[PDB]
Ligand binder design. Structure first.
Ligand SMILES: Cn1cc(-c2cn3nccc3c(-c3cnn(C4(CC#N)CN(CC(F)(F)F)C4)c3)n2)cn1
Length: 274
């Protein structure tokens, strides 16, 4: 339990469609000497958004893993519920890699890739489908650790099904998520391939998945493009096996995409060889 009176707004960290993350000092002693935390809150007073936010909070609370942002608790002002989590001083991987592209080499990129795989494999064991796997949702803990930092779109698989139908980051979506709104471990694997692309292009704005797909061309055009095996290009200086991994994640057939256990095995091998 966290007291609103002891939660001191420090700075804006990020913003989404219906939420925002802030850096706060949590100090019961009242002299700004306590612990710095990250706080997620909703933008406005809504019921459909609030119901989704409560489900998201219970999803995060249920997760305990080295590569998943740590849940700390909740803060009530009932409405207006706030999610308290650990603050990761280096911020998003999307921004971090854009800022330090000169200093980060392929071994480091493969270290981050492996950790994303491990975090994803753990989601799988819980039957959770992330649905929003992108570098913007990965946070940097330190130079040797990244964590999946947001679960706003995360769904729980039905007990008897390998997919969840929910009626959007379209440039990261698998074809069946675009055509049939079907989300699975396999569509999270497709999105992982897009993350691998993002990392090996060092977040070059002109080479981003929206930039590239729009040049190759909206949901209707993207469906046709993917059906005709239009794909993101090979990033400049890409190691051969990393491009083959991307290609395999992007198979139109759900059943021919690799597993997260196997991606972790393959990425660790490519990294060890270099
Ligand atoms: C120096 N520095 C540190 C940070 C920092 C630290 N932390 N520690 C926890 C979370 C963050 C974040 C952060 C930024 N964006 N995000 C999100 C995407 C994701 N992970 C979640 N948000 C979703 C919505 F709540 F806004 F809806 C966007 C999170 N930024 C920014 N600059």
């Amino acid at each position: 339990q966290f007291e609103e009176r002891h939660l001191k707004f420090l700075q804006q960290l990020g913003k989404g469609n219906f939420g925002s993350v802030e850096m706060c000092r949590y100090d019961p002693l009242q002299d700004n000497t306590g612990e710095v935390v990250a706080v997620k809150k909703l933008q406005h007073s809504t019921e459909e958004h609030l119901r989704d936010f409560e489900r998201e909070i219970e999803i995060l609370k249920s997760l305990q893993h080295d590569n998943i942002v740590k849940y700390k608790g909740v803060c009530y002002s009932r409405r207006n519920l706030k999610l308290i989590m650990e603050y990761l001083p280096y911020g998003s991987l999307r921004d971090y890699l854009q800022k330090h592209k000169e200093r980060i080499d392929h071994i480091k990129l493969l270290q981050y890739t492996s950790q994303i795989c491990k975090g994803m494999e753990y989601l799988g064991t819980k039957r959770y489908i992330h649905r929003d796997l992108a570098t913007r949702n990965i946070l940097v803990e330190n130079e040797n650790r990244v964590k999946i930092g947001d679960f706003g779109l995360t769904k729980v698989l039905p007990q008897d099904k390998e997919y969840y139908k929910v009626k959007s980051p379209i440039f990261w979506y698998a074809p069946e998520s675009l055509t049939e709104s079907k989300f699975s471990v396999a569509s999270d694997v497709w999105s992982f391939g897009v993350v691998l692309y993002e990392l090996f292009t060092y977040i070059e704005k002109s080479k981003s998945p929206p930039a590239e797909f729009m040049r190759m061309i909206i949901v209707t055009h993207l469906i046709e493009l993917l059906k005709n095996n239009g794909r993101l290009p090979r990033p400049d200086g890409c190691p051969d096996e990393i491009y083959m991994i991307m290609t395999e994640c992007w198979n139109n057939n759900v059943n021919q995409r690799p597993s997260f256990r196997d991606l972790a095995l393959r990425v660790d091998q490519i990294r060890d060889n270099m």
